[PDB]
Amino acid sequence: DPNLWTVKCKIGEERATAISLMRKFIAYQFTDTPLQIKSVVAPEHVKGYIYVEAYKQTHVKQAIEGVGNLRLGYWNQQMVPIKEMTDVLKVVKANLKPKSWVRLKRGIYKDDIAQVDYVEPSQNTISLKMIPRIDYDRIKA
């Protein structure tokens, strides 16, 4: 059973980190310097450090050498105990389902609980059900 290591990354650059290390692996699997990594875990609920799969601590050091996104947490590679290989894959309740209850972030109905009606397949806009709280143009000028 392979071990899991924790490396430090830039905040905001998790998916770019994963999509860059995957292309390094594919860019070096056929040379004289391959990569000994199995996978790299990047949860969407975290922000700041990622997870990597390797048997020994020298493999992560000889695999992440040369990347500028992982140059900060390069001098230290923490190790998790074996019971933490499972809590990493757990996701608590994507988040796109009709007839559900979402809230707003910007606009006038901030932090107001609404409902979804229809979803646009273009992934551009979404239908919402809220209640207007305007004055019907009586108080404002």
Next chain:
Amino acid sequence: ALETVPKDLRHLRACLLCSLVKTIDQFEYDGCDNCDAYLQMKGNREMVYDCTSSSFDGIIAMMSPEDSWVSKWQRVSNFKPGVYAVSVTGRLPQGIVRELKSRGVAYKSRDTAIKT
């Protein structure tokens, strides 16, 4: 290979059979690399938007499914190494699951995420 890596981070989805995480251009030009004779999602956009959805989370760089602890837990060890997901929510309609049982493909719920 170079085809299973999504080129752009915008408009990417994940399937409900092998949790294949790619961009919307590769599911239409090439499709599901882990199932092409049972799904046939290359050559159109209705079948790509029908089975494969965007409601998914969690990203893993599967490289050696024959030797890794995560690949056996997600039952993705008999698949091609590449971009996969760990919780792909949703369900197939009662229009493509009936043909999968008669052909010998047991459609499993890949959603390992807990509900409340």
